[PDB]
Amino acid sequence: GMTIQDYMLETPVRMREIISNADSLFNEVKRTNLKKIIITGSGTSYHSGVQVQPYLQNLLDIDVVKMYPFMITEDTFKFDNENTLVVGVSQGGSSYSTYNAMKLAEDKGCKIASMAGCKNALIDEISDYILTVNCGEEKSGAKTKGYYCTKLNLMLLGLQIAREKGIISSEKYNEEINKILDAINRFEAVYKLSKQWIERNKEKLVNSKEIRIIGHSDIYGDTLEAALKLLETMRIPVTGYEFEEFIHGIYNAINSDSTIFILDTGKEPRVTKMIDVLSGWTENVFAIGRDVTENDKNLKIDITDNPYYQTFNFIVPIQLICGEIPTLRGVDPSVPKDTRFHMKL
Amino acid sequence: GMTIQDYMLETPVRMREIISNADSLFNEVKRTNLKKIIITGSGTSYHSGVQVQPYLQNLLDIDVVKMYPFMITEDTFKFDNENTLVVGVSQGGSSYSTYNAMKLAEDKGCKIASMAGCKNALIDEISDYILTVNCGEEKSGAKTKGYYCTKLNLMLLGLQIAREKGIISSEKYNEEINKILDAINRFEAVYKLSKQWIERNKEKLVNSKEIRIIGHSDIYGDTLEAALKLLETMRIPVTGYEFEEFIHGIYNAINSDSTIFILDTGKEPRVTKMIDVLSGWTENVFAIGRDVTENDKNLKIDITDNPYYQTFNFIVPIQLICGEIPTLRGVDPSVPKDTRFHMKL
Amino acid sequence: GMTIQDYMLETPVRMREIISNADSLFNEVKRTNLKKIIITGSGTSYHSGVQVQPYLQNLLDIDVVKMYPFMITEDTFKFDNENTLVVGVSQGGSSYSTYNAMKLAEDKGCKIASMAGCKNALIDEISDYILTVNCGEEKSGAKTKGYYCTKLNLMLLGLQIAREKGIISSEKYNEEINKILDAINRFEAVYKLSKQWIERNKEKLVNSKEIRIIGHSDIYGDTLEAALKLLETMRIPVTGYEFEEFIHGIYNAINSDSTIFILDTGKEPRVTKMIDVLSGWTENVFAIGRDVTENDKNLKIDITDNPYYQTFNFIVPIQLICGEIPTLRGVDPSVPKDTRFHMKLGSKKLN
Amino acid sequence: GMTIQDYMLETPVRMREIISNADSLFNEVKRTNLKKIIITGSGTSYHSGVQVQPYLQNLLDIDVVKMYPFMITEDTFKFDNENTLVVGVSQGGSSYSTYNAMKLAEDKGCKIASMAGCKNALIDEISDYILTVNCGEEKSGAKTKGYYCTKLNLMLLGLQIAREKGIISSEKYNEEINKILDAINRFEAVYKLSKQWIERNKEKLVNSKEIRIIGHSDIYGDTLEAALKLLETMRIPVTGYEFEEFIHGIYNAINSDSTIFILDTGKEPRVTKMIDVLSGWTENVFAIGRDVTENDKNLKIDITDNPYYQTFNFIVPIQLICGEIPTLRGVDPSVPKDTRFHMKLGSKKLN
């Protein structure tokens, strides 16, 4: 069967085709009168909204919010709703959580868009703008390709609107696309170095008992996604945290059996002190970034320095762990623990 | 020294005095011209905003949002900011994360309020409205009292504004205060039943290896807080989840060593099926609520049925676990792992 | 069968209830016109007045004085006493001494208030304001809970008057309630440390022959109360003294069989020298406080710096001694020596 | 020293590169005026045309035909051929047969395009459009990568023309690229399952005496290519047949020493009966497809239902046999029998 690795390796070409299809895909939605955007989805789809919302709030002149579908209630839609676009994100396209939140928004007068990873998605039937993430089929439970492609599609929605409404010129739009292409171009080199790093640290990774990931606020969504994917495939406790929030009590639970991944974006001068203190408690601290100290446990990757587009390179190493290490712990990472779990609920 | 239990047991009288002081405390802030409220704080303070924001969005006619301090950037303050009230929440009153977010809001023209648990808090120096949570000193790392008192203070801010602006009449304000008092009045009975339940399940609780808490969206903030406090005191992996989000992949990591607390608010008809499926994988599933099946592992507590004010009773059992069980696992739950951790960072 | 320890442990719950009921209980009395307050009662009731009078004198704008009932006479009321409130304090509510003093006060035109620990108290009969101390029943001859709840009740009276009359703002009232709550919340922690200290010093305490307690003026009433409760339960000579007064001759009677408890509030720089001099005469010196030296005999407890609210914690250790040590000396400390002593003497004439 | 397997495994990366470079590569040719397309080449190049011609005929509005170079003559161009594009296909880029056919076409006024697997190909010399198949060098006599990348290149030509001329929308172009990408992404998974199937059937495969492949018409070009590559590497008789044509007399030559590979696309309801009849004559029947019966001899691979894009997966197993089994039969399958065969015969006259 197709593997997580297969899907990661085709991600660059899918992203380039998505960029090429953007003028056609967003030609209608860019022309709407918008005063607010709400991005909503469950699990990995929620993470794409968490990750890209800061970029969009920086780019656009309207409020851009992300919300779990459970947070969407009638109280979310008290004000003007005619100029609110609700973007429902679901790669499989049939999550009832997301469908239900979109249906409530529709009943309240909102404009509705869908971002599913297939044509004829369930969520498309209640959508005004079918903004398909054209990443192709991904028949693995641990989606990787789809995550990257969905974040990209959300950014292109922003750029397309920004250019149409005059926020950015045609040239600035092109400059940003070029920066995105620069990030995509680094994917395979990051993948290769990650594979080598995983091999060097194979024994400790295979013995992982519980994992925590510490990231910068600029990659908070990716930090949550890395955690969820490790949880689903390693099948042990895994949680993602922003650096400052980790300082607020999480250190209390660290012991010699703890594994910690530090996603170092270079914006936090206390990272070295954190690595030291944690290394005093566990031997399983691994740092990932452009300027980490080179030693066996660390992965030095030349990630684009743009704080937004680094999202297209940073968690590749963690996603490769999900594809490689579970197979050494008696698990096929693309098949869930219980295929009938959803049917049972 | 003072214990978590000591602080929980005085929570009712502190809440009643807070209610009594509200007309005086909120007399100035209720008179401001407000178009938006942002509640921000770290860790437990963030959880009070997560928990109460739905109540406030239901009550008021303006947008009410909660945000981690790391999410607050210059892009948060693009629009009109003169009518935006930023409420910085910090029980100790000196968290730099929260102070920094408030300072950025102040520099951008926002109205600033503080909700600290002491007079002369660091955050009060940059505040226009010092809205002290008058809960008294709490010299434990695992705050309980302060959490309840802060959520209460946030609700009273809402009621005080609502009444002044004509959203609710004087009588409706009184009706809501009465409902809050009804919730406070149930605290000791919930505490007593919780203590008995903990004693009955002592062996399994003491042997906890990793815990997950599953809650309803109406108690999502409390679900996160229960998780953080167990983490800090039990010193093992602990994560809180909303029910629907748990269905999106978290079940994959459940095994025979997993402990699961289900906070059953009675609004989810699939809870019984969830308990069954999980019970098939682990013997450590404990359900808490008004109508749970009575058996040794479950705690049936007559929580107020109001979906907002249930916040004053629901997690008492979990907070009592934090006070009692760590002492059987070689830990003083009021003292952190490393008293010098913050000084080291 | 409730013990002294049971009643001590109940005290924080009752105190919090009293605080929550204060707006109701004091709603009428706070509205009266007052130019003087006299607090009067016998024994432990007297001590509650001794202890809280300073707080009240500091808080209010009218003279607040405390007096033994035998001191109350027609000469106490020579000029206009229409604005004088006599607060009679009696936990059982039927002390004739106290009843008689109140009765004379009202004859001279004073307003009368009662603070009994039961409903339908004899003293309520002649009272304009029934300011019941709602601490519940206390079937112990050695009252503890009732002492704390009566001191609290007196403080609340002050606070309620102060707010009504404008001496303090509503927020200042709230702040003071919260400080009192901060003292009440330390009670259990102090009790636990007290129990460990007693166990560590068990032998010397069981062997007690005669005791003296030396306190700071801020806790003079509590010093007198601690001494009376030890006397009643240990059944040996026990006397309490303020620090300065002890210097005025009491040292002459100290010998190697003397036991001394020093309640060190941290405001007296001569305490170290006092301890050193006395420790040269007796091995039975026990210091209690926030910053006491490391010695098995000393009890380090972290009590508020507030000179008034420390009253809710300081003597907990001594009351615990009253509950625990007499049981090792052939006494049930909750039962007096002679249950018919008052009957044998007879009562004084009820006016 | 790159093997057939190395070149097969490189194929998805090269195909994705070609797809991303399509807008650049086909930008000029898509703009020409075309009324007919003739695709011509020898051997594997011929097969690429046989395989993709149906797709192209379905996609475009002009006749698309494929022809062996020997079939191209002056009679091929009797009327106005200004709008006829001859696409010469040659991976090495120097087949005289192909070069000569292109040369005559242009003499009659046709537009000329080349599809060589190297830069500066002999055939590029007379080409108006150098539509290089950018698959990289393939130093194997048994080409695999180049076959897949040439078929893709031909499909892209079609898609690029179709979009430019308005037959398909921009989104429809994008959708078709994504379907092709969906086939390309299954290549590795199919390779892995193929390798296991070969290992399981190793003995029968090593003992192969003569082989016939039976395919559906949708994969007729791939059936012919599979047969030629087995012939070149296994060095025994090998012939490929469409299903219906096999029924027209080929069954007469089947005996117990015959090996038969059935490429089952799921569109032929008689396949089960075919397998049953043939399995009665030989134990060497191997069926390959999405819904094949459970037998060690069968290879179940989940290939798209799309009759055109399945071409990127179906013959992977057969090419893998070409790389692996000849090594167990004394042959390096990447080196021909006689490296100087073409030299010994000589070339035909280059026009």
Side-chain angles (χ1 to χ4, degrees), chain A residues 1-34 36-78 81 83-102 104-118 120-138 140-191 193-272 274-339 341-342 344-345, chain B residues 1-34 36-78 81 83-102 104-118 120-138 140-191 193-272 274-339 341-342 344-345, chain C residues 1-34 36-73 75-77 79-81 83-98 100-102 104-107 109-118 120-138 140-272 274-289 291-293 295-348 351, chain D residues 1-34 36-73 75-77 79-81 83-98 100-102 104-107 109-118 120-138 140-272 274-289 291-293 295-348 351:
Chain A
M2 279 77 74
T3 59
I4 284 163
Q5 295 93 317
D6 288 339
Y7 295 124
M8 294 180 68
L9 288 176
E10 66 162 348
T11 295
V13 67
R14 296 291 183 156
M15 288 183 62
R16 298 183 175 101
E17 290 297 325
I18 287 169
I19 287 166
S20 297
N21 196 47
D23 290 344
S24 190
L25 187 63
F26 300 104
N27 192 47
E28 294 70 32
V29 71
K30 72 183 186 190
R31 303 171 186 283
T32 58
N33 190 24
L34 298 176
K36 181 177 174 177
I37 290 170
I38 297 170
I39 307 165
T40 195
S42 290
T44 296
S45 292
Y46 175 64
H47 302 151
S48 70
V50 176
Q51 180 58 37
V52 179
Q53 181 279 331
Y55 174 82
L56 291 173
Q57 189 81 358
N58 181 265
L59 183 58
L60 304 179
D61 292 343
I62 54 167
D63 272 332
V64 186
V65 308
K66 81 288 172 192
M67 303 184 61
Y68 278 115
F70 71 79
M71 293 164 44
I72 292 175
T73 74
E74 61 184 342
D75 298 326
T76 311
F77 309 116
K78 285 186 159 194
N81 301 315
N83 294 339
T84 294
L85 178 69
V86 171
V87 184
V89 189
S90 175
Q91 187 179 341
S94 58
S95 291
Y96 296 133
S97 48
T98 307
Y99 184 101
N100 289 339
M102 293 161 81
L104 179 50
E106 189 191 12
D107 294 341
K108 291 281 168 172
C110 296
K111 289 164 175 172
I112 309 295
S114 57
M115 296 198 174
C118 62
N120 296 309
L122 183 70
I123 60 165
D124 294 346
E125 72 187 6
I126 60 172
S127 300
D128 296 299
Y129 305 96
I130 294 165
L131 306 175
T132 319
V133 184
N134 291 122
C135 61
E137 61 210 345
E138 185 166 12
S140 161
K143 306 284 194 281
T144 55
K145 175 173 67 162
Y147 178 60
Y148 289 114
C149 291
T150 299
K151 288 185 294 177
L152 175 60
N153 223 42
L154 287 164
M155 291 172 157
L156 294 170
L157 174 63
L159 289 170
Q160 288 273 326
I161 289 167
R163 185 181 57 183
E164 175 65 15
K165 307 309 184 191
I167 297 175
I168 67 172
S169 64
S170 280
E171 181 50 42
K172 178 60 173 180
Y173 174 102
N174 293 341
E175 183 183 295
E176 295 308 308
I177 295 303
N178 290 348
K179 288 173 184 173
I180 296 172
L181 292 165
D182 175 71
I184 292 168
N185 289 340
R186 297 169 192 275
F187 196 98
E188 290 90 356
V190 171
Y191 187 104
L193 296 175
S194 297
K195 192 172 186 187
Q196 293 168 359
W197 169 76
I198 288 166
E199 181 62 33
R200 190 165 66 238
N201 290 292
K202 183 186 284 178
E203 179 183 6
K204 286 182 174 75
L205 296 173
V206 163
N207 291 330
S208 304
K209 295 174 176 50
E210 59 91 356
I211 301 161
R212 295 182 177 87
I213 310 185
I214 305 178
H216 187 271
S217 58
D218 291 341
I219 49 166
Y220 181 56
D222 292 335
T223 299
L224 297 179
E225 174 62 10
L228 177 60
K229 288 290 144 68
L230 283 167
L231 181 155
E232 291 173 350
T233 64
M234 302 286 286
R235 296 175 187 177
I236 53 174
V238 192
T239 305
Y241 306 87
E242 180 273 334
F243 190 98
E244 184 59 40
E245 296 302 302
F246 186 92
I247 295 169
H248 288 265
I250 311 305
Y251 64 93
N252 284 120
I254 303 300
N255 62 49
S256 66
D257 291 337
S258 299
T259 289
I260 286 71
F261 293 97
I262 295 168
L263 306 182
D264 187 3
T265 66
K267 286 191 169 183
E268 177 56 73
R270 299 173 290 175
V271 173
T272 302
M274 177 68 81
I275 290 166
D276 287 357
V277 176
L278 296 176
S279 289
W281 298 325
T282 176
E283 298 196 64
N284 305 299
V285 180
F286 308 93
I288 305 179
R290 301 170 198 90
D291 300 310
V292 294
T293 295
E294 293 173 278
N295 53 47
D296 287 354
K297 292 184 285 206
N298 294 348
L299 176 55
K300 183 176 179 179
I301 41 171
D302 190 19
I303 288 149
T304 176
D305 56 336
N306 184 286
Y308 300 116
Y309 311 129
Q310 65 176 333
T311 197
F312 298 121
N313 297 156
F314 228 116
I315 67 162
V316 163
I318 304 302
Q319 291 168 322
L320 189 50
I321 288 173
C322 297
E324 298 192 335
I325 298 304
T327 70
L328 304 183
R329 299 156 55 89
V331 161
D332 178 335
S334 290
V335 175
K337 176 185 178 79
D338 185 345
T339 59
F341 178 77
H342 297 269
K344 289 162 176 185
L345 270 282
Chain B
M2 279 77 74
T3 59
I4 284 163
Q5 295 93 317
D6 288 339
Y7 295 124
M8 294 180 68
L9 288 176
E10 66 162 348
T11 295
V13 67
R14 296 291 183 156
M15 288 183 62
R16 298 183 175 101
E17 290 297 325
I18 287 169
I19 287 166
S20 297
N21 196 47
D23 290 344
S24 190
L25 187 63
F26 300 104
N27 192 47
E28 294 70 32
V29 71
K30 72 183 186 190
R31 303 171 186 283
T32 58
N33 190 24
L34 298 176
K36 181 177 174 177
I37 290 170
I38 297 170
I39 307 165
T40 195
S42 290
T44 296
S45 292
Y46 175 64
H47 302 151
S48 70
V50 176
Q51 180 58 37
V52 179
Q53 181 279 331
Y55 174 82
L56 291 173
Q57 189 81 358
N58 181 265
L59 183 58
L60 304 179
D61 292 343
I62 54 167
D63 272 332
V64 186
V65 308
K66 81 288 172 192
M67 303 184 61
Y68 278 115
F70 71 79
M71 293 164 44
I72 292 175
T73 74
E74 61 184 342
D75 298 326
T76 311
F77 309 116
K78 285 186 159 194
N81 301 315
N83 294 339
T84 294
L85 178 69
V86 171
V87 184
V89 189
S90 175
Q91 187 179 341
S94 58
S95 291
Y96 296 133
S97 48
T98 307
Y99 184 101
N100 289 339
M102 293 161 81
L104 179 50
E106 189 191 12
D107 294 341
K108 291 281 168 172
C110 296
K111 289 164 175 172
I112 309 295
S114 57
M115 296 198 174
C118 62
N120 296 309
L122 183 70
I123 60 165
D124 294 346
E125 72 187 6
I126 60 172
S127 300
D128 296 299
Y129 305 96
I130 294 165
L131 306 175
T132 319
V133 184
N134 291 122
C135 61
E137 61 210 345
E138 185 166 12
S140 161
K143 306 284 194 281
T144 55
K145 175 173 67 162
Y147 178 60
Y148 289 114
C149 291
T150 299
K151 288 185 294 177
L152 175 60
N153 223 42
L154 287 164
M155 291 172 157
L156 294 170
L157 174 63
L159 289 170
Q160 288 273 326
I161 289 167
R163 185 181 57 183
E164 175 65 15
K165 307 309 184 191
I167 297 175
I168 67 172
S169 64
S170 280
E171 181 50 42
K172 178 60 173 180
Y173 174 102
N174 293 341
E175 183 183 295
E176 295 308 308
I177 295 303
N178 290 348
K179 288 173 184 173
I180 296 172
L181 292 165
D182 175 71
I184 292 168
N185 289 340
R186 297 169 192 275
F187 196 98
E188 290 90 356
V190 171
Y191 187 104
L193 296 175
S194 297
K195 192 172 186 187
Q196 293 168 359
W197 169 76
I198 288 166
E199 181 62 33
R200 190 165 66 238
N201 290 292
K202 183 186 284 178
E203 179 183 6
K204 286 182 174 75
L205 296 173
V206 163
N207 291 330
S208 304
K209 295 174 176 50
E210 59 91 356
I211 301 161
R212 295 182 177 87
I213 310 185
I214 305 178
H216 187 271
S217 58
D218 291 341
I219 49 166
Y220 181 56
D222 292 335
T223 299
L224 297 179
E225 174 62 10
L228 177 60
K229 288 290 144 68
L230 283 167
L231 181 155
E232 291 173 350
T233 64
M234 302 286 286
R235 296 175 187 177
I236 53 174
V238 192
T239 305
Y241 306 87
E242 180 273 334
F243 190 98
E244 184 59 40
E245 296 302 302
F246 186 92
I247 295 169
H248 288 265
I250 311 305
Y251 64 93
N252 284 120
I254 303 300
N255 62 49
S256 66
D257 291 337
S258 299
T259 289
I260 286 71
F261 293 97
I262 295 168
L263 306 182
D264 187 3
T265 66
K267 286 191 169 183
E268 177 56 73
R270 299 173 290 175
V271 173
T272 302
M274 177 68 81
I275 290 166
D276 287 357
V277 176
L278 296 176
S279 289
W281 298 325
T282 176
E283 298 196 64
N284 305 299
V285 180
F286 308 93
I288 305 179
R290 301 170 198 90
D291 300 310
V292 294
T293 295
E294 293 173 278
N295 53 47
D296 287 354
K297 292 184 285 206
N298 294 348
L299 176 55
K300 183 176 179 179
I301 41 171
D302 190 19
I303 288 149
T304 176
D305 56 336
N306 184 286
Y308 300 116
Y309 311 129
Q310 65 176 333
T311 197
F312 298 120
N313 297 156
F314 228 116
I315 67 162
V316 163
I318 304 302
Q319 291 168 322
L320 189 50
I321 288 173
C322 297
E324 298 192 335
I325 298 304
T327 70
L328 304 183
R329 299 156 55 89
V331 161
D332 178 335
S334 290
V335 175
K337 176 185 178 79
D338 185 345
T339 59
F341 178 77
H342 297 269
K344 289 162 176 185
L345 270 282
Chain C
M2 298 273 275
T3 60
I4 288 166
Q5 298 91 313
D6 294 324
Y7 294 130
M8 288 174 72
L9 293 175
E10 195 185 356
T11 305
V13 176
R14 286 300 184 180
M15 292 187 66
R16 290 167 186 150
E17 291 172 353
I18 291 172
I19 282 165
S20 299
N21 191 51
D23 286 350
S24 172
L25 188 64
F26 298 106
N27 196 59
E28 190 196 19
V29 67
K30 73 180 182 181
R31 302 170 188 281
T32 53
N33 187 34
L34 303 178
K36 182 171 182 178
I37 291 169
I38 298 166
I39 303 164
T40 190
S42 308
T44 301
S45 292
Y46 180 64
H47 301 147
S48 72
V50 176
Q51 181 58 42
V52 181
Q53 181 279 331
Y55 174 79
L56 288 176
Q57 188 66 14
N58 183 263
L59 186 56
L60 304 175
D61 293 341
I62 54 164
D63 280 347
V64 185
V65 300
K66 82 289 164 185
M67 304 176 188
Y68 279 120
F70 67 80
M71 295 171 55
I72 302 282
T73 69
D75 300 331
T76 314
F77 317 117
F79 284 97
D80 194 350
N81 281 256
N83 303 323
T84 297
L85 174 68
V86 177
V87 184
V89 182
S90 177
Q91 191 172 342
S94 67
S95 286
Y96 280 39
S97 41
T98 308
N100 290 346
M102 295 163 76
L104 180 55
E106 64 157 340
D107 291 346
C110 297
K111 292 170 173 186
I112 307 301
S114 56
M115 294 199 173
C118 58
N120 310 338
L122 175 287
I123 65 164
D124 296 346
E125 293 179 18
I126 62 177
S127 305
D128 298 303
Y129 315 104
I130 297 173
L131 307 178
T132 313
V133 177
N134 296 125
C135 60
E137 72 175 305
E138 195 173 0
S140 179
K143 307 286 194 284
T144 53
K145 173 177 70 164
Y147 177 59
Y148 289 112
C149 294
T150 297
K151 293 189 289 186
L152 179 54
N153 229 47
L154 286 162
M155 289 182 166
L156 289 171
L157 173 63
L159 286 169
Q160 287 270 325
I161 288 166
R163 183 176 61 181
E164 175 67 9
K165 306 313 193 182
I167 302 174
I168 66 180
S169 66
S170 293
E171 288 182 353
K172 180 65 178 170
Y173 177 94
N174 183 255
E175 179 175 5
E176 296 309 308
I177 294 304
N178 280 287
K179 293 182 177 167
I180 292 168
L181 287 173
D182 285 343
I184 292 173
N185 201 48
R186 297 188 174 186
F187 186 110
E188 178 79 10
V190 169
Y191 186 103
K192 288 171 176 177
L193 291 164
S194 298
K195 187 170 182 191
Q196 294 170 31
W197 164 82
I198 291 167
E199 182 62 35
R200 189 165 64 245
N201 291 292
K202 189 180 285 182
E203 177 178 11
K204 286 188 169 65
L205 298 171
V206 165
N207 290 338
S208 304
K209 291 175 179 53
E210 59 91 352
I211 302 167
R212 290 188 181 85
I213 305 174
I214 308 178
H216 185 271
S217 52
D218 293 338
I219 54 166
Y220 181 58
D222 289 333
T223 302
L224 295 179
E225 173 59 13
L228 176 58
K229 290 290 148 70
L230 281 170
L231 182 155
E232 292 173 341
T233 59
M234 302 286 288
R235 297 174 188 176
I236 59 180
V238 193
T239 305
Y241 302 87
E242 176 279 331
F243 193 93
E244 261 292 328
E245 66 156 310
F246 181 92
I247 300 171
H248 284 262
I250 308 307
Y251 66 87
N252 291 110
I254 299 303
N255 59 58
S256 73
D257 283 341
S258 301
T259 297
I260 311 80
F261 290 98
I262 300 187
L263 302 183
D264 177 20
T265 68
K267 289 172 83 158
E268 178 53 72
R270 295 176 293 169
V271 172
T272 302
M274 177 67 87
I275 293 167
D276 294 353
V277 175
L278 296 172
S279 299
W281 303 328
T282 173
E283 300 185 354
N284 311 309
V285 182
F286 305 90
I288 300 172
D291 299 307
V292 295
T293 300
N295 186 298
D296 281 3
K297 293 182 282 190
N298 297 341
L299 173 56
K300 189 174 189 168
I301 46 181
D302 181 24
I303 294 176
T304 177
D305 218 47
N306 185 292
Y308 308 115
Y309 307 135
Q310 65 180 337
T311 193
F312 299 112
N313 301 155
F314 233 113
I315 67 168
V316 169
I318 302 300
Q319 292 159 327
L320 188 55
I321 285 170
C322 299
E324 295 191 347
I325 301 293
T327 68
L328 311 181
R329 299 157 55 92
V331 175
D332 173 346
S334 280
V335 179
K337 179 183 174 74
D338 189 341
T339 55
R340 281 190 52 256
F341 178 82
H342 307 276
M343 298 301 291
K344 289 168 177 182
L345 266 286
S347 304
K348 69 198 297 184
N351 302 335
Chain D
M2 298 273 275
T3 60
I4 288 166
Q5 298 91 313
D6 294 324
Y7 294 130
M8 288 174 72
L9 293 175
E10 195 185 356
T11 305
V13 176
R14 286 300 184 180
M15 292 187 66
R16 290 167 186 150
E17 291 172 353
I18 291 172
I19 282 165
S20 299
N21 191 51
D23 286 350
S24 172
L25 188 64
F26 298 106
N27 196 59
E28 190 196 19
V29 67
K30 73 180 182 181
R31 302 170 188 281
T32 53
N33 187 34
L34 303 178
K36 182 171 182 178
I37 291 169
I38 298 166
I39 303 164
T40 190
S42 308
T44 301
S45 292
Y46 180 64
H47 301 147
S48 72
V50 176
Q51 181 58 42
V52 181
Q53 181 279 331
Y55 174 79
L56 288 176
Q57 188 66 14
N58 183 263
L59 186 56
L60 304 175
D61 293 341
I62 54 164
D63 280 347
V64 185
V65 300
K66 82 289 164 185
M67 304 176 188
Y68 279 120
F70 67 80
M71 295 171 55
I72 302 282
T73 69
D75 300 331
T76 314
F77 317 117
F79 284 97
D80 194 350
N81 281 256
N83 303 323
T84 297
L85 174 68
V86 177
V87 184
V89 182
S90 177
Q91 191 172 342
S94 67
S95 286
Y96 280 39
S97 41
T98 308
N100 290 346
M102 295 163 76
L104 180 55
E106 64 157 340
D107 291 346
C110 297
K111 292 170 173 186
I112 307 301
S114 56
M115 294 199 173
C118 58
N120 310 338
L122 175 287
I123 65 164
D124 296 346
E125 293 179 18
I126 62 177
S127 305
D128 298 303
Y129 315 104
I130 297 173
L131 307 178
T132 313
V133 177
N134 296 125
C135 60
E137 72 175 305
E138 195 173 0
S140 179
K143 307 286 194 284
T144 53
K145 173 177 70 164
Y147 177 59
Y148 289 112
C149 294
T150 297
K151 293 189 289 186
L152 179 54
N153 229 47
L154 286 162
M155 289 182 166
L156 289 171
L157 173 63
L159 286 169
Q160 287 270 325
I161 288 166
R163 183 176 61 181
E164 175 67 9
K165 306 313 193 182
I167 302 174
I168 66 180
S169 66
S170 293
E171 288 182 353
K172 180 65 178 170
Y173 177 94
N174 183 255
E175 179 175 5
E176 296 309 308
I177 294 304
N178 280 287
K179 293 182 177 167
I180 292 168
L181 287 173
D182 285 343
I184 292 173
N185 201 48
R186 297 188 174 186
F187 186 110
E188 178 79 10
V190 169
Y191 186 103
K192 288 171 176 177
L193 291 164
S194 298
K195 187 170 182 191
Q196 294 170 31
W197 164 82
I198 291 167
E199 182 62 35
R200 189 165 64 245
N201 291 292
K202 189 180 285 182
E203 177 178 11
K204 286 188 169 65
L205 298 171
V206 165
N207 290 338
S208 304
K209 291 175 179 53
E210 59 91 352
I211 302 167
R212 290 188 181 85
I213 305 174
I214 308 178
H216 185 271
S217 52
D218 293 338
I219 54 166
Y220 181 58
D222 289 333
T223 302
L224 295 179
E225 173 59 13
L228 176 58
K229 290 290 148 70
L230 281 170
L231 182 155
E232 292 173 341
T233 59
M234 302 286 288
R235 297 174 188 176
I236 59 180
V238 193
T239 305
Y241 302 87
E242 176 279 331
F243 193 93
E244 261 292 328
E245 66 156 310
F246 181 92
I247 300 171
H248 284 262
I250 308 307
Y251 66 87
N252 291 110
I254 299 303
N255 59 58
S256 73
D257 283 341
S258 301
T259 297
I260 311 80
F261 290 98
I262 300 187
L263 302 183
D264 177 20
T265 68
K267 289 172 83 158
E268 178 53 72
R270 295 176 293 169
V271 172
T272 302
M274 177 67 87
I275 293 167
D276 294 353
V277 175
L278 296 172
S279 299
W281 303 328
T282 173
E283 300 185 354
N284 311 309
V285 182
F286 305 90
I288 300 172
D291 299 307
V292 295
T293 300
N295 186 298
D296 281 3
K297 293 182 282 190
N298 297 341
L299 173 56
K300 189 174 189 168
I301 46 181
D302 181 24
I303 294 176
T304 177
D305 218 47
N306 185 292
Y308 308 115
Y309 307 135
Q310 65 180 337
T311 193
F312 299 112
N313 301 155
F314 233 113
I315 67 168
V316 169
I318 302 300
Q319 292 159 327
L320 188 55
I321 285 170
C322 299
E324 295 191 347
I325 301 293
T327 68
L328 311 181
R329 299 157 55 92
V331 175
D332 173 346
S334 280
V335 179
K337 179 183 174 74
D338 189 341
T339 55
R340 281 190 52 256
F341 178 82
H342 307 276
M343 298 301 291
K344 289 168 177 182
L345 266 286
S347 304
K348 69 198 297 184
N351 302 335

